[PDB]
């Protein structure tokens with residue numbers, strides 16, 4: 001549980017936003033790239049695994065699941081790369097609802113930034129700190145600290 | 150002290166590596182940029198504060214301390230921006246020692262990547278996972294979890 005993350009790719013302003021969700025907490029990290037490629041996804045995963053103890057990643061599609069560059073980065077970082085098939089059907093809708101909510105947050109900040117990448121990182125900040133009771137940033141730290149102890 | 154970070158800028162291959170250290174744990178996040186401007190520093194800080202509960206940052210020099218763009222991002226993200234003056238003189242040397250160790254790690258992986266940015270993220274991964282006994286990634290999570298609770 002503590003080490004499982006889900007990759008998700010969504011589109012806005014002709015660009016791609018790559019998102020990693022920590023499944024147990026809903027904490028996210030995201031980046032803007034011009035298009036999804038194996039190389040961009042592999043670099044994103046290397047960044048993520050240097051920051052949090054990433055044991056398993058459910059990939060967002062079969063191209064990233066197949067990608068030799070993505071498999072190389074998973075090997076390097078000690079990540080088990082898995083498929084992202086919603087064997088649990090509530091999962092299509094949950095990723096749908098996350099993208100919808102992100103895009104909403106991005107729309108609420110979009111005027112405070114010239115470049116979409118800034119607005120996405122403002123949205124990551126707002127999402128991770130939202131209490132709506134703990135925030136996602138609090139939950140992930142509690143989860144992993146409980147795991148270590 | 151769970152929320153205090155130190156910014157550090159170091160040079161390699163004609164490029165600049167921007168580093169944030171979480172002072173109590175030694176955990177780091179880093180990025181490669183072509184040069185250290187207010188805009189780049191401000192974006193780096195927005196990224197960092199969306200990911201960890203960053204309360205105070207000791208800026209790495211007076212240009213970033215003065216920068217209106219950096220002060221805008223610290224305002225937006227709820228960060229107290231401070232100077233990075235080593236009132237406690239063991240601080241020049243500790244920052245020095247960190248850069249030298251990062252650069253050593255980078256040299257140990259530099260052949261496994263074409264682009265410096267990949268090697269720096271490999272170095273972040275190896276630094277944060279190194280056991281020293283807990284790693285820096287473990288220390289930071291235990292510190293912040295103890296603080297939440």
Ligand SMILES: O=C(O)c1c(CN2C(=O)Cc3cc(Cl)ccc32)ccc2c1OCO2
Nearest residue numbers: 006021023025026094095097098101102127
């Ligand atoms: O509101 C949401 O649906 C949401 C979520 C929901 N979320 C969780 O809490 C757990 C989880 C697992 C997965 Cl696999 C996907 C989304 C989520 C996460 C991140 C977000 C969200 O909105 C923006 O960022």
Ligand SMILES: O=C(O)c1c(CN2C(=O)Cc3cc(Cl)ccc32)ccc2c1OCO2
Nearest residue numbers: 155170172174175243244246247250251276
């Ligand atoms: O070994 C080091 O000197 C080192 C450190 C040392 N470090 C700590 O453990 C606490 C700390 C506070 C500060 Cl303000 C700077 C460096 C460190 C941190 C990050 C690193 C390091 O090497 C690479 O990344």
